[PDB]
Design a protein around this nucleic acid. Structure first.
Ligand SMILES: [K+]
Ligand SMILES: [K+]
Ligand SMILES: [K+]
Ligand SMILES: [K+]
Ligand SMILES: [K+]
Ligand SMILES: [Mg+2]
Ligand SMILES: [Mg+2]
Ligand SMILES: [Mg+2]
Ligand SMILES: [Mg+2]
Ligand SMILES: [Mg+2]
Ligand SMILES: [Mg+2]
Ligand SMILES: [Mg+2]
Ligand SMILES: [Mg+2]
Ligand SMILES: [Mg+2]
Ligand SMILES: [Mg+2]
Ligand SMILES: [Mg+2]
Ligand SMILES: [Mg+2]
Ligand SMILES: [Mg+2]
Ligand SMILES: [Mg+2]
Ligand SMILES: [Mg+2]
Ligand SMILES: [Mg+2]
Ligand SMILES: [Mg+2]
Ligand SMILES: [Mg+2]
Ligand SMILES: [Mg+2]
Ligand SMILES: [Mg+2]
Ligand SMILES: [Mg+2]
Ligand SMILES: [Mg+2]
Ligand SMILES: [Mg+2]
Ligand SMILES: [Mg+2]
Lengths: 119, 88, 101, 73
RNA sequence: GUGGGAGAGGGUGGUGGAAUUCCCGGAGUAGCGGUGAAAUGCGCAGAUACCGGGAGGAACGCCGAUGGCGAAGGCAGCCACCUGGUCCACCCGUGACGCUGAGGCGCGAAAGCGUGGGGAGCAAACCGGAUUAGAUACCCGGGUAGUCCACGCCCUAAACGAUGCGCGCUAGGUCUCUGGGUCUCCUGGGGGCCGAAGCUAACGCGUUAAGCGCGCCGCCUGGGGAGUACGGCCGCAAGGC
């Protein structure tokens, strides 16, 4: 029980799943959800539809703390990043800003073979 | 580095006549200058190989000029080696 | 003997007694290394592009000086010893390169 | 494409070696932190190459961003 | 010689931000991860996702190139110091001092060896999960040597322009990097693309020659046996010539 009513929504999108955390203006999470939070199990988590009902699930859970206004941050590039912002768009939460914070390094670390051909 | 004052000094020193910047003596002098500088730089920084190549080249130049001088005028040669203290 | 430029970013929270303290410390450190000041421009507290030492702003002073080359590095080191000092940037002075001339 | 506006063409006569000048250097950066490519900076070989150094300098002094968050999307 | 230029050329010392990992704290709940699909794995000792603090190693996004530097190997955050090569203008000095170069000496990616540090990510071997007829493999989860540093070895390669070095001569055009001048343009130096003459078996090469010539060095002489055997030399070994 908080009565937050304003806050942040972090969409973390991968190729294997999409996951939405909804937090308070200071960044501490209020609730969250994901592909497997809802029924989904395998690859089907990284469905864009899954990301839809994940974002919606999170939104509904967030209305429970009585939230209205939310700034979005989107980290990651994957199937259903966009559809997660699109579900969130009118989830009943009204969306203030959208941002892309997706982390990229300056070539610090050596990626896995799968992710290689780069550095 | 090597400042212009240092250079002009050694040139004024080993010139054959005033105005000579080019004679074999002057050249061998300036070379000995740069060579000694580099030997000092390479006493430290022993791991710097490309500079070393440079110095190999400089040395080769010098031994060549000196060999010319000896072929030409042995007296000036003797004078030079004795003056800079070369031949090792 | 060459012309460099000393860049000093300072902590903005500074009291004047402590600020002037840091400045005269810089002075003594400059003199002690055989540097002579040519021009000085103290720009002051400006908003940075990203936190430095967790602080959102910084106090800038700039010194165009002529000093013996061999000592410069040592000097930089002295300059960084103080906690109130955040960045020290010492650049070899250059001639301004223009565009649209 | 990048036929829209060239940066040097939309600006005046400025010093390219000045890392202290902020508001000028700022216009050679992008939406995020990233230094703009030649085609959008309208600079030349040498010019670009020098801007890079002065910008990176300014970045170390904390006067220019290394990287920014992207808005909209 | 004088006056200047451009540059990831080299060595040493500083220093910056991003990311990954780990630790501390806060909030929060049932998964996360992963694939063709999965499982192993991690998670209620509270993970994943999110914010704050800290540690440690490694590498330097944009600029970034159809680019630059170096004899080659190769060189890329920023700053300073030490230092090599190189280009241009002036046409000032020396007066053939020149070229090449068997042997010698030095350098020499990666992996590898020795001693000692370091160890974040990655990762031979290995341990698991899959797929398959089997799968000592591709895929997934772990993971040691190693990768990093110092000192000392090793001397190899598609160490490739598969094109030795120097010089003289023989249409141009176009793009490009960097000097100088009378600065649309002229004139040096480098990198590309197309093409005179000519060459070439052809492909192609063509003022960056694979053209016309001269000097010097290296090398070749059907395929397999075989870069093997024997001998010598070098090496701590692996192994090299
Ligand atoms: K110079
Ligand atoms: K290239
Ligand atoms: K072993
Ligand atoms: K060969
Ligand atoms: K043998
Ligand atoms: Mg999945
Ligand atoms: Mg709505
Ligand atoms: Mg020079
Ligand atoms: Mg460099
Ligand atoms: Mg379990
Ligand atoms: Mg708990
Ligand atoms: Mg550790
Ligand atoms: Mg290469
Ligand atoms: Mg003359
Ligand atoms: Mg005469
Ligand atoms: Mg080696
Ligand atoms: Mg190695
Ligand atoms: Mg070892
Ligand atoms: Mg062993
Ligand atoms: Mg691993
Ligand atoms: Mg594996
Ligand atoms: Mg040319
Ligand atoms: Mg023809
Ligand atoms: Mg071809
Ligand atoms: Mg052609
Ligand atoms: Mg036979
Ligand atoms: Mg035979
Ligand atoms: Mg062999
Ligand atoms: Mg033996």
């Amino acid at each position: 029980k908080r009565q937050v009513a304003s806050g942040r929504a972090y969409i973390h999108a991968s190729y294997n799943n999409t996951i939405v955390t909804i937090t308070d203006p200071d960044g501490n999470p209020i609730t969250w959800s994901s592909g497997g939070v809802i029924g989904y199990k395998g690859s089907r988590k990284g469905t864009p539809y899954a990301a839809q009902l994940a974002a919606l699930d999170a939104a509904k859970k967030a209305m429970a703390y009585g939230m209205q206004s939310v700034d979005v941050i989107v980290r990651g590039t994957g199937a259903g990043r966009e559809q997660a912002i699109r579900a969130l768009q009118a989830s009943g939460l009204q969306v203030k800003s959208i941002v892309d914070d997706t982390p990229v390094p300056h070539n610090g670390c050596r990626p896995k073979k799968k992710f290689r051909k780069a550095s | 580095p090597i400042t212009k004052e240092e250079k002009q000094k050694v040139i004024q020193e080993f010139a054959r006549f005033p105005g000579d910047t080019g004679s074999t003596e002057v050249q061998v002098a300036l070379l000995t200058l740069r060579i000694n500088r580099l030997s000092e730089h390479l006493k430290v920084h022993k791991k710097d190989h490309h500079s070393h190549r440079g110095l190999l080249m400089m040395v080769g130049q010098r031994r060549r000029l000196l060999r010319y001088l000896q072929r030409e005028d042995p007296e000036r040669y003797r004078a030079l080696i004795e003056k800079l203290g070369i031949r090792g | 003997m060459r012309r460099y430029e000393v860049n000093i970013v300072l902590n903005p929270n500074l009291d004047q007694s402590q600020l002037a303290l840091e400045k005269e410390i810089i002075q003594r450190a400059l003199e002690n290394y055989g540097a002579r000041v040519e021009k000085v421009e103290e720009l002051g507290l400006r908003r940075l592009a990203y936190p430095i030492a967790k602080d959102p702003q910084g106090y800038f002073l700039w010194y165009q000086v002529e000093m013996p080359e061999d000592r410069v590095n040592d000097l930089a080191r002295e300059l960084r010893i103080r906690d109130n000092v955040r960045r020290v940037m010492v650049v070899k002075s250059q001639e301004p390169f223009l565009a649209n001339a | 494409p990048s036929r829209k506006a060239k940066v040097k063409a939309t600006l005046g006569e400025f010093d390219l070696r000045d890392y202290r000048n902020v508001e000028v250097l700022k216009r050679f950066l992008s939406e995020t932190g990233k230094i703009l490519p030649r085609r959008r900076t309208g600079l030349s070989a040498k010019e670009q190459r020098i801007l890079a150094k002065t910008i990176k300098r300014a970045r170390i002094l904390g006067l220019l961003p290394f990287t920014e968050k992207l808005v909209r999307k």
